[PDB]
Amino acid sequence: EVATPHRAAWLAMML
């Protein structure tokens, strides 16, 4: 729901 960068989004998913 919030604009997150590709690297930031990848890190959040994979912990």
Epitope: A3, T4, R7, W10, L15
Partner: antibody
Framework: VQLLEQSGAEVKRPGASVKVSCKAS????????IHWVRQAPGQRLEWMGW????????KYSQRFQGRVIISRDTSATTSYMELSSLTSEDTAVYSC??????????????????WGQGTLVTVSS | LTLTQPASASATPGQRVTISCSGS????????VNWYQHLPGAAPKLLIH???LRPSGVPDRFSGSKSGTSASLAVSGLQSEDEADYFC???????????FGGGTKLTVL
């Protein structure tokens, strides 16, 4: 070699639901995220969602939230995508792709690789 | 926001063809562009990742360039096997997900 095998074609009536599988081999199944995309005929690819098979947490595109469920089976090293309330607009080729992720040392993004062969799902009355 | 890409492209064998990909600040301006070869009866094959890097099996012919919100795939020395569909791909922050170009059908004359 890393291979993603994907289930055969499906024919569904409108309003029904379909469950497409994605079997993984050649790599540690829980160390790479799985993406689900679709391509309707004569249309660009449309990203649907993605999942971390290690922990099972899944996120979805806004256009598909509430209609798609992405799951996985670690024992079978298989990822599943279930699409509900099918309509004629849901006819497309469905594909799963492995997310190679970021290299920590170089910071490089390694691309989505490899790709499943696709599954043609036809929604027709 | 989506990726704009020319509908078609063509050239004779042995020539160089360039395929454009147009994006915005949220997809190409801030994130990397990835290129895929999509044969008519095969799964898409990664050609360029991180805007210019090629996997081990990709020949020297394929190269990638990036300038801000625009990107381009250059194919030099066309061969009959190169006749396929090429599409660009990039993460979009607003969608929080991947976006893809429309694809450029490349026919080698």
């Amino acid at each position: 070699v890393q291979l993603l095998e994907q289930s055969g074609a499906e024919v569904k009536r409108p309003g029904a639901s379909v469950k497409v599988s994605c079997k993984a081999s050649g790599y540690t199944f829980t160390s790479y995220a799985i993406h689900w995309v679709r391509q309707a005929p004569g249309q660009r690819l449309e990203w649907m969602g993605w999942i971390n098979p290690g922990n099972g947490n899944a996120k979805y595109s806004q256009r598909f939230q509430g209609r798609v469920i992405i799951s996985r089976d670690t024992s079978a090293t298989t990822s599943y995508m279930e699409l509900s309330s099918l309509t004629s607009e849901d006819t497309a080729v469905y594909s799963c792709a492995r997310d190679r992720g970021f290299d920590l040392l170089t910071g490089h993004y390694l691309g989505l690789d490899p790709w499943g062969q696709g599954t043609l799902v036809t929604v027709s009355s | 926001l989506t990726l704009t890409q020319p509908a078609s492209a063509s050239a004779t064998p042995g020539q160089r063809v360039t395929i454009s990909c147009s994006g915005s600040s949220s997809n190409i301006g801030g994130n990397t562009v990835n290129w895929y070869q999509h044969l008519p009866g095969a799964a898409p094959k990664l050609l360029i990742h991180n805007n210019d890097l090629r996997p081990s099996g990709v020949p020297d012919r394929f190269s990638g360039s990036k300038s801000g919100t625009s990107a381009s795939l250059a194919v030099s020395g066309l061969q009959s096997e190169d006749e396929a569909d090429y599409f660009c791909a990039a993460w979009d922050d607003g969608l929080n997900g991947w976006v893809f170009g429309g694809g450029t059908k490349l026919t080698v004359l």
